Amino acid sequence: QQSPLIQTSNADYKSGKDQEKLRTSVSINLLKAEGQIQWKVTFDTSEWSFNVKHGGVYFILPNGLDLTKIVDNNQHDITASFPTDINDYRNSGQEKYRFFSSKQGLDNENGFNSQWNWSAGQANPSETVNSWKSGNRLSKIYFINQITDTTELTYTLTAKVTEPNQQSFPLLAVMKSFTYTNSKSTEVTSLGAREITLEKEKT
Numbered sequence: 670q671q672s673p674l675i676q677t678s679n680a681d682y683k684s685g686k687d688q689e690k691l692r693t694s695v696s697i698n699l700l701k702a703e704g705q706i707q708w709k710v711t712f713d714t715s716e717w718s719f720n721v722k723h724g725g726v727y728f729i730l731p732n733g734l735d736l737t738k739i740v741d742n743n744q745h746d747i748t749a750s751f752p753t754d755i756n757d758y759r760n761s762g763q764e765k766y767r768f769f770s771s772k773q774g775l776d777n778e779n780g781f782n783s784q785w786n787w788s789a790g791q792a793n794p795s796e797t798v799n800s801w802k803s804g805n806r807l808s809k810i811y812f813i814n815q816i817t818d819t820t821e822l823t824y825t826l827t828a829k830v831t832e833p834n835q836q837s838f839p840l841l842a843v844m845k846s847f848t849y850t851n852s853k854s855t856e857v858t859s860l861g862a863r864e865i866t867l868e869k870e871k872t
Contacts, residue, residue: 672864676804678691679855683852691704691857694712695713695842695843697861698863702867708826712816713821717846718849719818720817724846725845726813729785729807729841729843731808731839731840733835736748739825741822743811746858751767755790760779760861768812768834785802789841792843806839843861845857
């Protein structure tokens with residue numbers, strides 16, 4: 670029910686012998702997929718120095734799934750921390766928890782394409798991830814700023830299937846530094862992605 674894990678990053682020779690570690694820092698693992706899908710996202714923050722200069726993480730959901738619950742690495746249900754209206758003042762850039770939606774806004778600072786470009790679009794995404802974006806398969810981004818941990822962080826996400834004629838569901842997650850950059854002066858950014866397949870329900 671899950672395709673092979675995709676990991677990409679814009680880390681390059683400037684990161685030296687951490688390049689490969691930075692590239693393979695994000696993982697996604699299906700827990701259960703049976704009108705609901707539940708998955709875990711793991712960010713290995715060990716080589717990122719977020720306790721010196723903070724980073725951020727992003728969870729990207731496809732059209733056809735609506736997030737119902739997200740639990741952080743402290744087992745705290747943070748679902749209600751995210752705005753639901755992209756233009757809410759509590760969704761501005763000073764805020765720790767932010768939400769972006771292709772149904773609400775595309776370009777501008779709180780647009781889904783801008784925030785893609787600042788996250789997965791920066792992480793040298795592969796053709797599979799780029800085809801999800803160009804085919805308008807992806808729609809929501811949940812973002813957490815002020816990540817300062819140095820361990821592996823696991824988030825557990827649950828979503829409801831909203832499209833009854835859909836079997837394939839791309840899931841993605843991204844982490845970056847907001848200070849350290851690659852040789853091209855772009856924030857070091859890494860991604861993890863897998864596609865989930867649901868069995869067709871007989872009716």
